[PDB]
Amino acid sequence: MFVKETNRAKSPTRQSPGAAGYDLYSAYDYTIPPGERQLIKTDISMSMPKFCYGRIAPRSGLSLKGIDIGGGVIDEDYRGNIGVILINNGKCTFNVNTGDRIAQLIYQRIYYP
Amino acid sequence: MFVKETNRAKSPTRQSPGAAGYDLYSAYDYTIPPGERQLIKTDISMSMPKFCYGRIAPRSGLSLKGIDIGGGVIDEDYRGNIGVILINNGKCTFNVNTGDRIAQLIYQRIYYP
Amino acid sequence: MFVKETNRAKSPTRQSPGAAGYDLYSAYDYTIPPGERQLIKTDISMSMPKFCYGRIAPRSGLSLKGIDIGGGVIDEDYRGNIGVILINNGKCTFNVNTGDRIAQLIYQRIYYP
Numbered sequence: 001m002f003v004k005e006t007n008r009a010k011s012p013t014r015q016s017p018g019a020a021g022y023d024l025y026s027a028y029d030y031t032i033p034p035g036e037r038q039l040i041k042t043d044i045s046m047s048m049p050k051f052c053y054g055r056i057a058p059r060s061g062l063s064l065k066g067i068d069i070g071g072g073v074i075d076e077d078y079r080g081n082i083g084v085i086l087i088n089n090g091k092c093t094f095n096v097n098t099g100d101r102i103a104q105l106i107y108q109r110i111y112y113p
Numbered sequence: 114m115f116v117k118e119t120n121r122a123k124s125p126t127r128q129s130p131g132a133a134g135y136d137l138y139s140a141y142d143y144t145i146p147p148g149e150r151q152l153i154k155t156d157i158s159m160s161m162p163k164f165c166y167g168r169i170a171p172r173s174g175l176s177l178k179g180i181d182i183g184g185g186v187i188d189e190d191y192r193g194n195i196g197v198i199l200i201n202n203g204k205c206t207f208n209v210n211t212g213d214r215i216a217q218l219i220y221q222r223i224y225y226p
Numbered sequence: 227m228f229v230k231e232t233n234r235a236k237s238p239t240r241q242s243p244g245a246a247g248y249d250l251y252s253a254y255d256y257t258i259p260p261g262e263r264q265l266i267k268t269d270i271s272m273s274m275p276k277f278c279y280g281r282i283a284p285r286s287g288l289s290l291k292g293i294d295i296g297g298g299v300i301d302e303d304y305r306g307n308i309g310v311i312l313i314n315n316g317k318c319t320f321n322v323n324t325g326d327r328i329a330q331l332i333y334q335r336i337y338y339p
């Protein structure tokens with residue numbers, strides 16, 4: 001499912017039994033200015049479960065501080081690094097440190113109507 | 114499923130049998146400035162259905178007015194008041210009155226691959 | 227599933243075999259100034275598959291350029307044209323040409339608790 005590309009990568013974890021998906025962590029330091037966005041690297045290479053797709057989903061605590069998720073639809077049987085688009089829609093600079101929890105990866109089945 | 118914590122709370126409703134989820138209503142009054150966000154309280158405590166999570170989803174009419182949803186991933190078998198992060202990305206202030214329909218809560222089952 | 231209302235409409239495509247949903251295309255020319263949003267017409271009418279709802283989901287390519295999705299919850303047995311709210315949170319004017327891929331429509335079955 002998940003492979004570490006570097007020793008900076010942290011394995012995606014589940015916060016709770018009833019967690020919708022997997023916690024994602026930044027592998028690098030970032031500084032996002034207000035009204036700007038940054039693609040954050042996890043350094044986790046992922047293999048999409050067959051007949052499923054992924055959605056990068058917001059942390060509530062970050063959303064309360066103005067930080068939103070851009071994009072995050074992971075499909076087409078994607079194999080590669082997990083990137084997270086953090087959008088700073090707050091008034092102040094937002095700092096990301098290596099190892100910070102940044103988002104959740106939620107799996108759902110592809111529906112074929 | 115839904116417990117009104119105060120007399121200001123309104124029971125979440127499915128308006129049509131084809132609705133994805135349950136209409137949520139503000140339990141309080143708010144005035145959201147342009148470029149700002151606010152956690153809107155519903156005063157509704159929810160019991161999560163087993164192996165499910167909830168997503169706060171936008172009203173289309175509000176999205177056309179520049180109002181978006183922040184956060185809104187309700188998981189971890191969450192027990193407590195439903196809050197909706199309303200983001201005003203319009204040019205003018207957005208008024209939220211008690212009783213206003215603010216969002217929809219959509220349930221999905223958790224997929225643990 | 228999909229019906230063209232005009233000669234300008236382009237039929238939604240499932241890209242890869244592991245695509246989450248169907249690519250949507252603009253039927254018209256649009257100019258979106260920074261900090262503004264626009265409802266983009268596809269001129270494609272849809273009939274909702276039984277016990278399902280739709281979600282307009284972002285293209286990663288546009289999200290990385292600062293283009294986000296507003297609204298996009300298609301429920302309540304929806305019959306009619308598909309429109310996509312594109313939000314220009316970039317710093318320059320965003321151009322939408324006829325035939326441009328603008329988003330994806332992702333179907334999910336409604337969970338009834």
Ligand SMILES: [Cl-]
Nearest residue numbers: 099100101102
């Ligand atoms: Cl943490």
Ligand SMILES: [Cl-]
Nearest residue numbers: 055168170281
């Ligand atoms: Cl979403």
